[PDB]
Amino acid sequence: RRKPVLPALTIN
Amino acid sequence: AGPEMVRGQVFDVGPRYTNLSYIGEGAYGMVCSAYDNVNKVRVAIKKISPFEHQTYCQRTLREIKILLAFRHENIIGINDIIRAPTIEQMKDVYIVQDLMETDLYKLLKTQHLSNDHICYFLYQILRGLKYIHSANVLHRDLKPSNLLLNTTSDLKICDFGLARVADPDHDHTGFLTEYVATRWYRAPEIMLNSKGYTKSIDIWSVGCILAEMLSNRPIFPGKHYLDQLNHILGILGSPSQEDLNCGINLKARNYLLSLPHKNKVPWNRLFPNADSKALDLLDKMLTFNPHKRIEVEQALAHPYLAQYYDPSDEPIAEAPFKFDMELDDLPKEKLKELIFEETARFQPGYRS
Ligand SMILES: Nc1ncnc2c1ncn2[C@@H]1O[C@H](COP(=O)(O)OP(=O)(O)NP(=O)(O)O)[C@@H](O)[C@H]1O
């Protein structure tokens, strides 16, 4: 159940 | 045919790696994105030309030896190393790594992080660091530009050119004359002790990074060494007598007592919009005295990270890492041979 998501970031 | 080129510089990694695009330059290497035609993936490739100088060769050897020895989710790996078939022909070295989307320095120029992101980022940093510290290795140059990220918030620590084995006894006179991009992340004992490097220096850097995530500005900026120190004092306040009771070299403690007294500034005043659990532990991380400064395991085990802490899923090194020789001692012609041998395992014929 390991990886926490968490909304995506936006990268220039 | 001729080698691929980027900004007028030879970038000779074809035919395997093509479609180069410039990403950036550190002080030591030019970095590009590329396409690996053999494995059908995007990669980063770092070009390094360190052979004209002893310090550069030192950095290159350490980074390679360390990244090849470490395997951990939160530490950038090395996938491949390209260099000439003979030592006389080797003038550059190309290091191939997974392509990350950005670094934390670039991200922070463009946006403010939600507390959730900050928390997760912090956890991953400390998770990597625990691993590094388990091998008794100190990174010694943690800073936002050394923290690679992608859009899913995966984080990897990079840039181990200044790493070394933890030794309470080494002299500090190199590693100050030698150039680094910033200095805003250096622990105070580095500047005012005369001997050694301890695991506590990395923790201080992590604290500086957390502060920076909270406010989008570096907490201890400053132009030169004395200036830099003033910024630290102006926030933490003049050092307690117990604080001056340590490895602090004299001609520094005298310098310290020389200074007009300064008052501590409460954390919540500097960071009003910050989770209180974060400011505690920020406090524990940025303590002037290395001995009381929180350790990496403890920090992982602080309330702020409770939602992530998982000692079962936090790997450690099999054994301490070791350098056979003092790399400071070796001249550049020797380090060149060591780099040649170290990279041989990526060569077609290689023996073993
Ligand atoms: N694997 C990677 N994927 C994507 N971008 C990267 C990668 N590695 C480095 N970069 C970018 O290139 C910049 C410079 O790399 P860096 O490894 O820090 O070079 P340097 O001269 O060895 N160290 P430094 O001078 O402290 O930045 C980084 O700060 C990153 O933004």
Author numbering:
A (entry chain B): 4 to 15
B (entry chain A): 9 to 360
What does the paper say about this structure?
Mitogen-activated protein kinase (MAPK)-binding linear motifs bind to the MAPK docking groove and represent a functionally well characterized linear binding-motif class. Furthermore, for extracellular signal-regulated kinase 2 (ERK2) the protein–peptide docking surface is comprised of a small hydrophobic surface patch that is often engaged in the crystal packing of apo ERK2 crystals. Here, a rational surface-engineering approach is presented that involves mutating protein surface residues that are distant from the peptide-binding ERK2 docking groove to alanines. These ERK2 surface mutations decrease the chance of ‘unwanted’ crystal packing of ERK2 and the approach led to the structure determination of ERK2 in complex with new docking peptides.
